[PDB]
Write a protein that binds this ligand. Structure first.
Ligand SMILES: Cc1cccc(Nc2cc(Cl)nc(SCC(=O)O)n2)c1C
Ligand SMILES: Cc1cccc(Nc2cc(Cl)nc(SCC(=O)O)n2)c1C
Length: 264
């Protein structure tokens, strides 16, 4: 029945995220292949195909950094939506207080985002636009400050995360564990969430034992990546606040505004 819990989480994962690791690595290996975005010329081409209403609105008059930022925001909104439904399908979660649900998701969504973002990254770039764009690490490094600092720390995390060779069945449990975290600020009923977390991590521990018998400390490694992600998000939010207050035209979508409000 612990395999029940694992298979349920995994199936809710396969069902709620449009992009999964199996699908992503196919696209990242080589009908409707991804348009490679590596300079301004290819960015403009890709935009004319994938966001024609925006181009018609004149977005290509804006700095490339602003369009990339708003592309990033749009993807974050979509993934928050998917993560919210995934969480809703985690055994015990929807039994939690409605206030604590919002708290767990508020603090957890970006840790889960950057964990799953590794699935669509390789050492040269990341998939965007539902698999129909591949924007290169170097083009993103090439942007003006502060925008060139957005993505490279996520690439750094992802290269070491992907070195662990986790599959979607591992990742789904990792993300569940990320979300069911008993030490978030603001939690009403911490004891239930800890009992929920304990149950998820126990399943994760058993699953890694079965699925990766060759990596002796993989479970402790993953706990450390959880700490690494929380520090990554803290730093990300500070760079995002710098851009919000400093960069005109880089306004914050309201769903994301509310996530960052009173976070760190
Ligand atoms: C890599 C990629 C793929 C598809 C489109 C775009 N450009 C975008 C994407 C989005 Cl969601 N938004 C914008 S500009 C938004 C605005 O200035 O109101 N520009 C980019 C930068
Ligand atoms: C799944 C995926 C792929 C590519 C980009 C994004 N969203 C990101 C990623 C990164 Cl490293 N940075 C941002 S800045 C805007 C925000 O804080 O949502 N947004 C996401 C969530």
């Amino acid at each position: 029945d612990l395999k029940s819990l694992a298979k349920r989480i995994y199936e809710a994962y396969l069902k709620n995220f449009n992009m999964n690791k199996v699908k992503a690595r196919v696209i990242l290996s080589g009908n409707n292949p991804p348009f490679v975005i590596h300079d301004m010329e290819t960015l403009c081409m890709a935009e004319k195909t994938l966001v024609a209403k925006l181009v018609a609105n004149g977005i290509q008059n804006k700095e490339a950094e602003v369009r990339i930022f708003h592309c990033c925001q749009c993807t974050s909104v979509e993934t928050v939506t998917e993560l919210t439904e995934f969480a809703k399908a985690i055994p015990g979660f929807a039994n939690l207080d409605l206030n604590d649900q919002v708290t767990l998701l508020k603090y957890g969504v970006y840790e889960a985002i950057f964990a799953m973002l590794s699935s669509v990254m390789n050492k040269d770039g990341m998939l965007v636009a539902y698999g129909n764009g591949f924007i290169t690490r170097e083009f993103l490094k090439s942007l003006r400050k502060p925008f060139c600092d957005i993505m490279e720390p996520k690439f750094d995390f992802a290269m070491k995360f992907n070195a662990l060779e986790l599959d979607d069945s591992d990742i789904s449990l990792f993300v569940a564990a990320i979300i069911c975290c008993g030490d978030r600020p603001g939690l009403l009923n911490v004891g239930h969430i800890e009992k929920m977390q304990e149950g998820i991590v126990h399943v994760l521990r058993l699953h890694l034992q079965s699925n990766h018998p060759d990596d002796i400390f993989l479970f402790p490694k993953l706990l450390q990546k959880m700490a690494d992600l929380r520090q990554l998000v803290t730093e990300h939010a500070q760079l995002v606040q710098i851009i919000k207050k400093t960069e005109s035209d880089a306004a914050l979508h309201p769903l994301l505004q509310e996530i960052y409000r009173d976070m760190y």
